[PDB]
Amino acid sequence: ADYDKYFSNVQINNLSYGVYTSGGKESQFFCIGIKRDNVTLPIHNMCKVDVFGSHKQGFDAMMEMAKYYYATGESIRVYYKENVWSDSEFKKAFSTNELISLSTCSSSDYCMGPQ
Amino acid sequence: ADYDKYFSNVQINNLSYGVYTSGGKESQFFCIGIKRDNVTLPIHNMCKVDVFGSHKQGFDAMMEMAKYYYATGESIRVYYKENVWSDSEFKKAFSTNELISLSTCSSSDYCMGPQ
Amino acid sequence: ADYDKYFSNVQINNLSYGVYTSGGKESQFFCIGIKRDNVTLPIHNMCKVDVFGSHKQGFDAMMEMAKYYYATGESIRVYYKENVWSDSEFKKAFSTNELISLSTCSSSDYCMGPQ
Amino acid sequence: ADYDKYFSNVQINNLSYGVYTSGGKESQFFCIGIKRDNVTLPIHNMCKVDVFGSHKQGFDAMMEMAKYYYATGESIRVYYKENVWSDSEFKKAFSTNELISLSTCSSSDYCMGPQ
Amino acid sequence: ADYDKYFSNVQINNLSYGVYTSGGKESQFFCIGIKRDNVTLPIHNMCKVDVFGSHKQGFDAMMEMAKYYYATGESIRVYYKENVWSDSEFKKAFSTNELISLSTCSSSDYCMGPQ
Amino acid sequence: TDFVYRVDSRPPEEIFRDGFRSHGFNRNLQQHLRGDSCAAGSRDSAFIATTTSLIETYNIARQYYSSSGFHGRLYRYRIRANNIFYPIQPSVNYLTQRGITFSGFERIMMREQNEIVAVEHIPGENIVEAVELTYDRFNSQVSDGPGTTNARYVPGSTFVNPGVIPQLVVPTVSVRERINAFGSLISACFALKGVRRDGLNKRATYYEPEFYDARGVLKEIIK
Q1: Interchain CB contact of F201 with D (< 8 Å)
Q2: Taking a C-beta distance cutoff of 8 angstroms, is the pair E48, E57 a contact?
Q3: Is B28 helix (H, G, I), strand (E, B) or coil?
Q4: Nearest residue to E9 via CA among E98, E82, E112, E99
Q5: Which chain E positions have a beta carbon within 8 Å of D52's beta carbon?
């Protein structure tokens, strides 16, 4: 798959969770906000969106990992891909980046996962 | 959707969960109570209600975010909409406000999510 | 529903979970023991019982909250119903009370929920 | 049912979780290790086994409580029965005792549950 | 089963979770990175891969157990077998080792489980 | 005006006199809040934990009485706070934009304690009264026994210090570490070993309960 885009050694400093209807469809989402020690890089938003009635996509597991890392403030690597969501107002708040993977960083020069 | 109503920089200071039957079917509810300061807020209760056996509506995910923010006492933004429930020895306790979204507030004038 | 019976400002001081066969089918149960310090209570035990394969009744959600409150020793309100079970050494061990709802108490004179 | 065998006031000092195959079919297990100080224990192992695709037997609920009690190091009562399993390479490792119930001990000669 | 390969008294010092598509189906993976005190081991990565909609293989239970030990930094034993995945995207990052079992080590030379 | 509590095994006689003492002068606040400096590790904390929660005092007491190992008695001690009692939040803020990080799990822990810390010493003249706690295994409940009044108590209209703890230690190596707790997520600083204890009788021992890492317990009630 496409695991070529990521930010390493970042921290989650914001979370968002919600349910919304758009275009006749009901969804649930969560978004993370990332920072790199108070320098606020070019892309700082990743979301996962789950349309009710779609198949399992690891939404809960992904969300619980995000919540854990937000809680510890740990340095992590965040993998993402482009997913232009369908609510125009949703992309206005959270951009078009879909969270696909989370990894810990045991040191300032190693993060787990593909590179 | 309607993400127009919310309270920013607030804390969850009370939780409630329960099961009840109405119209021959068994349902689930959970509510949060919110506060800002020493004085109680005019609108302080938001709930999510779920009929057992229905499709995923992010009830559990919401309940878990709420518990987390309750546990940390963190400053968050709470999104809600007006929902006239169907059992109304239910609005009796918990008002007509449906909980829709939860976001963190990294500083006293920024909260994640739509504005 | 019947939320008329409850105890305010109590704590969970005991938990119980188990699996049993009775009347010919396999079941699940969990129980809480409650206390009010320096005050004896008429009732100290509430349970929730689930026969495997029955409809969703919020067993897991209720059990997880109970564990949560047992862990923090928090002040809560407990709602219960009279439920004559009939594995009955179950009633000799766990009484005839069905746990219906759990709510937090932010102060010694406010608990969330119907009153 | 048979809640006849139990050890009171013990602590969980070890955990084990895994997946294994026997007879071309896959299962999951978890086992607890128990200890009691100054009252030596004749038995030190209880397990629960779940054949994948079999019907619900409270494997997750049971495991969830074991994990919690292992975390707190609390004194508990443990109920077990004899189940000489099907894999006997399994019994050489984890013995033939099946965990059926877990209860807290509010004090050192009172535990919740049947006696 | 094959519980012949394991490392005793190690700590989980890295986590990885993700979602990816291969062929026509979406999968999820979870991996741990392990350490022995001050050092790195010849084999230090174990993963579990799960195709969404496939048969239960204890992916979440394993994932939750790993998260707990990662959170406590506890000394554990890790059982693994060789599983050459065939997405080799994945092997260059996570090797051909599948996590099959996790056990606690109550002392510096006792770990629960088969030996 | 602001009153706080602390449970102890030493008779009203003695702590009306002596009060409570910290183990030392270490003002590494994080190290104390983790129950390290004050209980588990090198006992040298500059702080004495107190709680504003009656309910918490009963939860502490339960962890001793509930064991057959504990041969002592316990008293709830009521204390008047003043300008050397501090709430932790302003000090936490003070530390956190000095780069020191408090995890979500730490903040959950702190939020369960209802805690107010006192520096170095709490004089016996701030201690209003003492209530002997009685345990009953009959229904496993803690009760209020006899109530002792401190004749030496000094009245006063005084509140908790609303500011930051002075000369706070701000660490060069802030990392995530064990959160020492007991009972129902009670900080270790609230245990008997939280303060300097009496030690002239070299043969004597007393019962401390089971301590554990709260990181594990919190991991199991949050997800």
Answers
A1: no
A2: yes
A3: strand
A4: E112
A5: 55-58
CATH number for F13: 3.90.210.10
CB-CB contact of C67 with C4 (8 Å) = no
Mutate to test the interface with D, among C14, C25, C27, C31 (most CBs of D within 10 A): C14
Sheet holding F211-213, edge to edge: F186-187, F180-182, F211-213
Measured distance CA(A101)–CA(A65) in Å, rounded: 10
**Structural domain harbouring C55:** 1-115
Query: CATH no. for residue E80?
Result: 2.40.50.110
Residue of B nearest to C79 (CA): B18
Q: How many domains does chain D have?
A: 1
F186: left (phi over 0), alpha (psi -120 to 50) or beta: beta
Number of domains in chain F: 1
State both tokens at A98. 């879909």
What Cα–Cα distance (Å) separates residue E108 from each residue in B70, E103, F223? 39, 13, 30
**What is the DSSP secondary-structure string of chain D?**
-----EEEEEEEEEEEEEEEEETTEEEEEEEEEEE-SSS--S--EEEEEEETTSPP-SHHHHHHHHHHHHHH---EEEEEEE---S-HHHHHHHTTEEEEEEEE-SBTTB-SS--
| Cα(F195)–Cα(F8) distance, integer angstroms | 9
Please tell me the distance in Å from A71's CA to the nearest CA on chain E. 11
| CA nearest neighbour of D110 among C16, C70, C18 | C16
> Chain D residue closest to C12 (CA)?
D106
Residue C25 CB coordination number (10 Å): 11
Locus of tokens 């021992």: F205
* Residue type at position A46: M
In chain C, residues with a C-beta closer than 8 Å to the C-beta of B93 are 112-115
- Residue for token digits 């006899």? F146
Question: Rounded CA gap, B27 and F65, in Å?
Answer: 42
CB pairs < 8 Å spanning A and E: 73
